Amino acid sequence: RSPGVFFDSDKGKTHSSGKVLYNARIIPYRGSWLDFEFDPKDNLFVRID
Amino acid sequence: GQNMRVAFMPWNGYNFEDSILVSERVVQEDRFTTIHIQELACVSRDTKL
Amino acid sequence: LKAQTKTEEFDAIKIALASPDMIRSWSFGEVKKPETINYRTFKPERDGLFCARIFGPVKDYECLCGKYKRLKHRGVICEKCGVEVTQTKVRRERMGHIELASPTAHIWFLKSLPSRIGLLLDMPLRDIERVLYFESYVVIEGGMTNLERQQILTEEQYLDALEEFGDEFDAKMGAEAIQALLKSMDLEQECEQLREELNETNSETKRKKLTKRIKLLEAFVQSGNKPEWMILTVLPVLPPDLRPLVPLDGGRFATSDLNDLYRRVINRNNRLKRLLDLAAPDIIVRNEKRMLQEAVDALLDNGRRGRAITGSNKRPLKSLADMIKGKQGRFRQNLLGKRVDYSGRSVITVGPYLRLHQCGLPKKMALELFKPFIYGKLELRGLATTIKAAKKMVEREEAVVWDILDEVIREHPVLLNRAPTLHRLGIQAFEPVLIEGKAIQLHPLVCAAYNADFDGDQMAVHVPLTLEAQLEARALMMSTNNILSPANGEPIIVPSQDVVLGLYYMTRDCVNAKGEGMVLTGPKEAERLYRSGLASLHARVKVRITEYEKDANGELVAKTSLKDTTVGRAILWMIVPKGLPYSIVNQALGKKAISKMLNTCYRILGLKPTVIFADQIMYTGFAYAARSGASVGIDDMVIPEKKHEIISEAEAEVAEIQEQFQSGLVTAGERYNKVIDIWAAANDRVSKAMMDNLQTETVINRDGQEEKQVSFNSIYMMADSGARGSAAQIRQLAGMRGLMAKPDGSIIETPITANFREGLNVLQYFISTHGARKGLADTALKTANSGYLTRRLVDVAQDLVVTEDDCGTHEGIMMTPVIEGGDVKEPLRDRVLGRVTAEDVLKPGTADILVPRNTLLHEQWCDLLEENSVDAVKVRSVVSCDTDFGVCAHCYGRDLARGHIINKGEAIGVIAAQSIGEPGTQLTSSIQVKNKGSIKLSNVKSVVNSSGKLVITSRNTELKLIDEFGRTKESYKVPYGAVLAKGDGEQVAGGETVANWDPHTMPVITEVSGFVRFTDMIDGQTITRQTDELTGLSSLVVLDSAERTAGGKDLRPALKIVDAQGNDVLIPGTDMPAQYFLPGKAIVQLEDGVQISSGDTLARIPQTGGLPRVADLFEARRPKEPAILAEISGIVSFGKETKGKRRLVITPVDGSDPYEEMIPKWRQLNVFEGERVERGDVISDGPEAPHDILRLRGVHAVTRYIVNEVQDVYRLQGVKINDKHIEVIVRQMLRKATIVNAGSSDFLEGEQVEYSRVKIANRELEANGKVGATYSRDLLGITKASLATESFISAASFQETTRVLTEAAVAGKRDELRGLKENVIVGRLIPAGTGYAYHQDRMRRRAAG
Amino acid sequence: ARVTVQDAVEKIGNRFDLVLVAARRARQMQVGGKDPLVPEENDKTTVIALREIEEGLINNQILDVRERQEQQEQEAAELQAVTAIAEGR
Amino acid sequence: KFWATVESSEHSFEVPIYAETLDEALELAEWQYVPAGFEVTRVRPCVAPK
Amino acid sequence: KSDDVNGRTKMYKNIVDGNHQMEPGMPESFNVLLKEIRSLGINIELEDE
Ligand SMILES: [Mg+2]
Ligand SMILES: [Zn+2]
Ligand SMILES: [Zn+2]
């Protein structure tokens, strides 16, 4: 997977809601990953690696 | 490999599933003959004995 | 006589907790030092992990120091260093021990899922670990004081409590504390108190959680174990040879990680022992104790605390738990396989010169295999001086040893096996025939059974050494002894490819050829006519034949006549033996009829004639197939001339729908469907074009102009005979191939027009690619899935084996044809044959017994039942078998590689699982009668309308077509409100209209007649006013009770039938009046005051599959959207709906207590709101839950559900599996049952139906008059049913090893064997088959005097 | 060579006990206690025992009876010998 | 007791819910089910002829 | 043929002696497992006669 930013969906299977989801993922060529993801409550979250 | 004269026809069950019937000519002409070179090593080590 | 002391052949096993003394018993010494060897002259350092004194001598029969080196010295212990001089094998035996400084918890019993110490003490795990780590104090036997027993304290709290009461109170911390807790515990008194408590408070949860624990407790008491032993005092050390230090080339050594772990444990323990003598401060000694606990834990089971790493290597060291568990999922030693001597393997090939009982065995291979036999056979005759000389002889390959090998090879069979073994046919015994070459020659007729191709598949050979193994291989595993599939009685030896093409080309007929019309005296001069090039193979000829029949009693009758046949068929008749009628070979003989020939030959003549017949058939098949000169050219595939037109028209069609999309006449989603439909419809045209242009295409002439017959075209002969290829496959070569689909899963609207014969442009190929890739991946995955299913199935069955002979029960199931949809998706003679009757069936005229009581139904019996019109036979089944812990022969059936009834001791569960799992790789609006018969209405209440028609008032209604014979052909279901033009006992013809209705409408009709009144219908509340704008005819639409107003939501709208007087017309024959309420979104028909009659609708209301399906079935998985059933028979009602859901109030006409359930209203209903429904009726449609079937319908219903569903899956793929196997899987599934009443065992305990029945049946007499307890059958999935096993050794295999071993240990489980898997693990004769006798005899010697 | 054991299976119905009995007989022959009841075609003790089963001149019953008689042969011959052991008193 | 039919994810199943009332059984079901992101489909009373 | 350390040799001798039999025993595997299990606080023993 080429280093850069990548925006995904992950729709259907999450929590049945049909509300889908949206997540951004910043992948470097070296070092830690930076993730930003949503959730059923429409709150924005962040996880390192 | 080597192209050769081939006939499509059942021969006494000898070709049964995927199997192949080869003329004695092919083995006589030494055409499908293959040469292999094996490397066999002998080790002289040291033991307490 | 003295019982015994020393080692005889042992019975069963016992597992339990080990006392410190019991541990010291095994120990032949203590290991006091971490040292291993001497580091220079490598020798065990005394009192080390490796020691000669503690364990054993490094060399056989020699002392360590070297004092006594002679084999004479045995029981002598050396004086310098005590080592008894004995074989070094004892270094694999002798245990050892370690005296621990401070007590140490056994991690298995501490960290187990229930946490055995914890629930024994009724103490939470967190608190126990808190104590062990010296985090907090815990009181023990607090006596009469301020504090309780199990109560935990802290530093300050313990100090203060100590300042108050010095004595009469006790508290400790660490492992010693838990040890004290366990030791002080009185099981008896605690039990008594629990018994007093169980009887006071009446509550489900309380008494359940109480009774479970008291059960566990008394179990622990009777176990013989003791709580103290959960805390380790002495630590056993494993024999050194099981953790070898053995050296390697280059001087480097290698050893087990158990050495590292053990060494750590010893080191830390010694350090603790030193620190105690040094009087170190608490902060130190505590740390050392914790380190000791950590080390010991890491030794026993690593990964439950720190995951300790081995020296110089990152990878975590492998502990004893990991030694027992092994790896590769759940496998422990002999399950996952093992290496075997006297064996080999190689590439496989042809050899049709072979006979069905033999196989080509390479000279060199056979030599190296039977090499030990050759050795003895050489010096037996005196050809060799001694064994060494024999070895030298076969090593020199002296010319004599070949002829000497031919002796040992003669009657000594060999086992041939393939890689993907599924069904028992995967391993078959043959007779060795010496062959020059390195390749193994296999008989062609077996290639079907092995599923082995000639494309470079390899097979393995095994030598049956012991006499018993030879006779087992010859009388059981022999090739000729199995001619039949274990799945179904059909022949597995059926000719495959070239042979069937040969017999096809023989028995085929041509319109005009040499010898047409001429007559022949017999087969001899027929073959003589053909072989001379005089008469053609296929030509119409009358010949004199002599056909026999065995129709006399036990006797062959001879008859002779002139049959009209072909020359080829007549030549073929020279083969077919004895009683078989000439009509068998008189046909074209496709792959089907050629099989039924062999079948009938087996069911008439016998085994031997069938075998020799089969061999002859293969021989002549290959022969004439060779003679046939059949080939495949490029001109053999004929493309339809009209194809190019069919495309164009279709290519026009899409264009139409392409324009309408631009003009907005059609929507996008509609356009897509239109285009895909027309394009897919074109393919059928091209395909059924090429077929007609193929099959009959040959147009020939006989003494005249033209006559056409079946084509002699090669590829077509192949496809039609069954040699290879099929319609779908030839379709891809000639006609267009399919319409591919993008990875999205959606189908592309531009199908592939070109075929394989034609070129393929870039695109088309690129599009075919995804199909190819996904195909390969799919198959590769389905292999694994099939394997797993097979595994689960073998696990759930296994030990089930025929034990008794005849249990003698009239119980069974009702066997009728499946009668699915239009006609008979499977006949009666199939589901019947091979299965012994439960009770004597009768002719249509009664008092006549054709088949008495229980008799195995074979071909003749089933034929007799076929003479008569009988549509049903009651059959004994494995699921209904009264035999406990097994199955009687008279229940199971006959079917096997032989036609005879099932033997005694054969293991049926295994072959059942195999038979189900082997084929599993292949897996993925008005009634109009198709035939002529008489109408029969089953289970229906209806009424006659004012139109003279017949309207059905029943939801569950069946329509059967019973012809003049009295047999049921057609079967359908007729919905409520359907209009029948006929009645029960009527007459219809083929295609005649019987039932009619509408899908989108659920008409609510009226049985009685009169005016229509209106009650509880108020506008704006219950109903609403809507008038059609295209007509002006209206109805007041019933407003659903979700959307209604404030107070109008509480009223139930209805249509009540009134007569001329204004009274209420009652439901016929009852006190109860007739008022039909209406549901939500239900539009009416006629308004108030308007008169109606019967049949007039009061209001009209609007509206997976494959292998994983089988998996879901056998696992009894509840579906996603289950059909709800009526729990209790009665009249349904709708209470006031609540909370987004709807109440459903059932009203029993019989007793009492009207039951109400919560059904979400969004789910579309089924049941009439104002009518009665029996238990098991459908309140809504959709998939049915198996548990619901078992509970609301019954065992016989649910077993039928399973078998019919799984067979619906398999039969759809064209796969034959006898219902038997599935029935045994079912038997294993419902094995468990949960008790209801009491008087012997516990209340809610789940327990085996066999166990429970064997108890209550014993309690129906003697005992108490009957104190016997009621139960309820329970449906368990195959994996959950497999989870239950008496043998802990068997359970240690497929389940989680740790948990099983622990739970079994604390209980003191005694494994009596008696099962298959556990006996295999321990390496003794299987309690079935050959061994069944042995284990039977012993079983009788046991539990007796 | 015996191609199909069906005939043998007909005698003693079973087909597991066929293997047992025929093995027992094959033991009686192979490691010599005795000779066979049927002319040897150069068939091994396996096939010989199976043939003997087919001809119905051998089975479980007959074997047990015969062995029980051999015990009487050996108990006959040993009579004086073991009765000379009265020293036990 | 009362068997509550809960459906979520790829499949469904029934769980025992103890209570003194059908309505109470429903409330105790939802309170002990819904908030986890599990749907509550059905509630049935336990029969068992005795 | 596999796991029995005595069984193998005691067989081979009979194989060459012209005696087809077997004098089986406990496969070294299961015995090793007995030792491994008994290396813990678990006591596993064989009973009766
Ligand atoms: Mg293959
Ligand atoms: Zn010594
Ligand atoms: Zn039975």
Coordinates of N, CA, C and O and ligand atoms in Angstrom, one line a residue, chain C residues 63-68 78-83, ligand 2:
Chain C
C63 N 28.2 -48.6 34.7 CA 28.2 -47.6 35.7 C 28.7 -46.3 35.1 O 29.4 -46.3 34.1
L64 N 28.4 -45.2 35.8 CA 28.9 -43.9 35.3 C 30.4 -43.7 35.5 O 31.1 -43.3 34.5
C65 N 30.9 -44.0 36.7 CA 32.3 -43.9 36.9 C 33.1 -44.9 36.1 O 34.3 -44.7 35.8
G66 N 32.5 -46.0 35.8 CA 33.1 -47.1 35.0 C 33.6 -48.3 35.8 O 34.3 -49.1 35.3
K67 N 33.3 -48.3 37.1 CA 33.7 -49.4 37.9 C 33.2 -50.8 37.4 O 34.0 -51.6 37.0
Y68 N 31.8 -51.0 37.4 CA 31.3 -52.2 36.9 C 30.8 -52.0 35.5 O 29.7 -51.4 35.3
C78 N 26.8 -48.7 42.5 CA 28.2 -48.4 42.6 C 28.5 -47.6 43.9 O 27.7 -46.8 44.3
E79 N 29.7 -47.9 44.5 CA 30.0 -47.2 45.8 C 30.5 -45.8 45.6 O 30.3 -44.9 46.4
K80 N 31.3 -45.6 44.6 CA 31.9 -44.2 44.3 C 30.7 -43.2 44.0 O 30.6 -42.2 44.7
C81 N 29.9 -43.5 43.0 CA 28.7 -42.7 42.8 C 27.6 -43.7 42.6 O 27.6 -44.6 41.7
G82 N 26.6 -43.7 43.4 CA 25.5 -44.7 43.3 C 24.8 -44.6 42.0 O 24.0 -43.6 41.8
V83 N 24.9 -45.6 41.2 CA 24.2 -45.7 39.9 C 23.9 -47.2 39.8 O 24.9 -48.0 39.7
Ligands
ZN2 ZN 30.3 -45.4 39.9

